[PDB]
Each structure stands twice: as C-alpha cells, then as structure tokens.
C-alpha cells in the first residue's frame, strides 16, 4: 500500500524514502537519523532522514516494523507530527509540511486473526 501511494504520487515505487525501524533496535540510532552534535564524529554530514527530506520535501516517509525499536526513539516523531519541524545536528529546521508518515506493526496480529470475523471494524 505504501508503494501504491508512491506509485500514485510519483509514478514509481522506489521514488521514496523507506527507513525500516528494525535496524534501530538500540536507542542511539536516533543520532543516525537526526545527526550528530557539533564536536562529534559525523557532524558535517547531517542526519539521513533530515537530508533526505531536505532535498525533496514533497515525499513519503515510511517507517516499518515499529515494534522492533526502543520506545524512546519516538520523541523525534513527537516533534515531526506536532509541527513538521525537525532540527538536525547543525541546527536548522527541516520542514515536513509536505510529507506523509506511515508506521506499520504487527501488534495484535493474534487478536486480529482471532477476531476479525464476527466483529465490526470499529470495536
């Protein structure tokens, strides 16, 4: 479905940014996507996610396997879904006002396979 949105929007599946969150099962890969502060190693490169937006802001940002990562990666996306703002390691804001954020998991898959029958969509 995410590749279907990318194909609808951009005439291509991989004209997008997929960042699979199973790679980020530790905490500190927050610094992989938002960058590193002044002083430290990868300062002059930027975060991957912020630069990948900063080229082509009208895009689709995909997060997959969201149950794999540590729970406190998701202060970054608190900023993101509050204002579309994100501040990389050099300290400039990156506008996410033209982005779509999709997060997938398999949380209640036992419960969904158990009770999708004989139940409404709502409850």
């Amino acid at each position: 479905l995410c590749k279907a949105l990318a194909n609808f929007m951009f005439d291509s599946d991989e004209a997008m940014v997929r960042i699979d969150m199973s790679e980020f099962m530790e905490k500190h890969s927050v610094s992989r996507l938002v960058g590193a502060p002044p002083g430290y190693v990868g300062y002059e490169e930027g975060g991957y996610l912020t630069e990948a937006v900063r080229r082509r802001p009208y895009s689709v940002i995909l997060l997959d396997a969201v149950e794999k990562a540590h729970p406190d990666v998701f202060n970054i996306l608190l900023q993101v879904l509050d204002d579309g703002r994100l501040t990389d390691g050099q300290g400039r804001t990156v506008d996410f006002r033209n982005t779509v954020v999709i997060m997938t998991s398999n949380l209640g898959s036992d419960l969904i396979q158990e009770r999708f029958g004989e139940l409404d969509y709502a409850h």
Partner: peptide, 24 residues
Amino acid sequence: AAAAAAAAAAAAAAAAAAAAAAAA
C-alpha cells in the same frame, strides 16, 4: 636605470579539525 620594486608576496596557511567520539 631601473629600481627593483618591493613585492606584495601573498601567503597561505591551513587548519585541521579534531573529532571526539562516544564509546558505547
């Protein structure tokens, strides 16, 4: 009767930059 002109003689220097590292 020429006089040797004193020059301007533009120069050059450089500067490195360290990088610390966390150690997890």
